[PDB]
Design a protein around this ligand. Structure first.
Ligand SMILES: CNC(=O)c1cccc(Cn2ccc3cc(-c4ccnn4C)ccc3c2=O)c1
Length: 384
C-alpha cells in the first residue's frame, strides 16, 4: 500500500520529494567546515557527483528565458518567461529562501502551491511546475496577459455595468475557494488577474487557511493588506480569533467601493489611521457627495462593509447572488464566464506585457560552521 505514495503527486514521499531530500542534504553539508567530519565526507564522496548530474536533468531556472518582471511581493518577484526547449510562455514566481527564513515565515507557500496545482478551476491560476534551487522556490503558472484589476481601474472610469460583472466573477472565484475548504484572507485587485478573454482568476494564495469542520479558523495574527483587512481579522491580532469565510466578503465590498468611487473606503495617511478607520467603520465609511453611485450599489457596498454578525454573505452566497445590484442584461450567474468580458485585451504577441507596469531592480545565507539545515523546510516543494 506504500508504492501508491511514491507515485502520488500529493504524497510527502513521492520521487520528487525524495530527490529534494537528497539534494538538500548535499547542499546543507557541502562546506569545508563540515567536511572535517568523515561521516559527512564519506557521504559527499559517494553522492556529490550523481547529485550534480541529476541537478542538470531536473528542471532549473536556466531552462527559461526571462522576458520581463511583471510583479513583486515581500519575498520575491513574478517573471514573464519562455521555456526555451518548448517555447511555451509562463508566469514564474520566485520566493527567496534566505528572506523567508530570515523573517521566520517559511510555510505559506505550501497552500499556494497546492491550490494552483490541484484546484482545477477556471477561477484559479493553474500551476504547472514547482521546482527549486539553493536560493529560490519557483512556481511556473499560466501567464495571465490581461493584467490585474489595479491596472484596469487606473486605465478606466469603471461603469456599474462593469463593476457588476467583475464583482460577480470575484464572488464566484471566492465561492470556489471556499468550497475547497479555504478562506482567502487577502482578496484585493492586485490578486485579481484577467486572462486573454478578459475573465478573472485569483492568484496570490499566500494567506490562505484551511477551515475547521465548523467552517472556522483559529488565528491570532492579523493577515492580508491594510486597505482590505476586515474588522474581525484585524481584531484577531493577539486575541484568539475565531472567524469564518465571510471575512472574504468584506474585501469584496472594499473592492466594489474602490471600483465605483476611485479610492479605498478607509484610506488614511498612515497605517495606524487605516487600522483605526476600519475599527471605526460604522462612522468612517462615507460616500463622497459627488459620487453618483446608484442606490443598489451603495446598498450592496454597505451590506459588505459591516460587522460579520450582520454581513451579507454570512449565510452563504445565494443571498449575495440575488442582490438587485446584480440585475443586468449581459450575463447570468450560470454562464458569466462564457459571456463577453467588459474589456477584452488586445494582445500583439504571446509575450505581450503591455497590461503590466515596468518594475526596476539580494542577500544569501552565511556559510555555516555546524549543520544548520536551511534547506530542510523546502523538501517536497518540487512538483511535475
Ligand atoms: C508572501 N508573498 C510573496 O512574497 C510574493 C512574491 C511575489 C509576488 C507576490 C504577489 N503576486 C503579485 C503578482 C502576481 C502575478 C501573477 C501572474 C500570473 C500570470 N500572470 N501574472 C502576472 C501571479 C502571482 C502574483 C503574485 O503572487 C507575493
Amino acid at each position: 500500500k506504500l508504492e501508491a505514495l511514491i507515485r502520488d503527486p500529493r504524497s510527502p514521499i513521492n520521487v520528487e520529494s525524495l530527490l529534494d531530500g537528497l539534494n538538500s542534504l548535499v547542499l546543507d553539508l557541502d562546506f569545508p567546515a563540515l567536511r572535517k567530519n568523515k561521516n559527512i565526507d564519506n557521504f559527499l564522496n559517494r553522492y556529490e557527483k550523481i547529485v550534480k548530474k541529476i541537478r542538470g536533468l531536473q528542471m532549473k531556472a536556466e531552462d527559461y528565458d526571462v522576458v520581463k518582471v511583471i510583479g513583486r511581493g515581500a519575498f520575491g518577484e513574478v517573471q514573464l518567461v519562455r521555456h526555451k526547449a518548448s517555447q511555451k510562455v509562463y508566469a514564474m514566481k520566485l520566493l527567496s529562501k534566505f528572506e523567508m527564513i530570515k523573517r521566520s515565515d517559511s510555510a505559506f507557500f505550501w497552500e499556494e502551491r497546492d491550490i494552483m496545482a490541484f484546484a482545477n478551476s477556471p477561477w484559479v491560476v493553474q500551476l504547472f511546475y514547482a521546482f527549486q534551487d539553493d536560493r529560490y522556490l519557483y512556481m511556473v503558472m499560466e501567464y495571465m496577459p490581461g493584467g490585474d484589476l489595479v491596472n484596469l481601474m487606473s486605465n478606466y472610469d469603471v461603469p456599474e455595468k462593469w463593476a457588476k460583472f467583475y464583482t460577480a466573477e470575484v464572488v464566484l472565484a471566492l465561492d470556489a475557494i471556499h468550497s475547497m475548504g479555504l478562506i482567502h484572507r487577502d482578496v484585493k485587485p492586485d490578486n485579481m488577474l484577467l486572462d486573454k478573454h478578459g475573465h478573472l482568476k485569483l492568484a496570490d494564495f499566500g494567506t490562505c487557511m484551511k477551515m475547521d469542520e465548523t467552517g472556522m479558523v483559529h488565528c491570532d495574527t492579523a493577515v492580508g493588506t491594510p486597505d482590505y483587512i476586515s474588522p474581525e481579522v484585524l481584531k484577531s491580532q493577539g486575541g484568539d480569533g475565531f472567524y469564518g469565510r465571510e471575512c472574504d466578503w468584506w474585501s469584496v465590498g472594499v473592492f466594489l467601493y474602490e471600483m465605483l468611487v476611485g479610492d479605498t473606503p478607509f484610506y488614511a495617511d498612515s497605517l495606524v489611521g487605516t487600522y483605526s478607520k476600519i475599527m471605526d467603520h460604522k462612522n468612517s465609511l462615507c460616500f463622497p457627495e459627488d459620487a453618483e453611485i446608484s442606490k443598489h450599489a451603495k446598498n450592496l457596498i454597505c451590506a459588505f462593509l459591516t460587522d460579520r454578525e450582520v454581513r451579507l454573505g454570512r449565510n452563504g452566497v445565494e443571498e449575495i447572488r440575488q442582490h438587485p445590484f446584480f440585475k443586468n442584461d449581459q450575463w447570468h450567474w450560470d454562464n458569466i464566464r462564457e459571456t463577453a468580458a467588459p474589456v477584452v485585451p488586445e494582445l500583439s504577441s504571446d509575450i505581450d506585457s503591455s497590461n503590466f507596469d515596468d518594475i526596476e531592480d539580494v542577500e544569501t545565507f552565511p556559510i555555516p560552521k555546524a549543520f544548520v539545515g536551511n534547506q530542510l523546510p523546502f523538501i517536497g516543494f518540487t512538483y511535475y
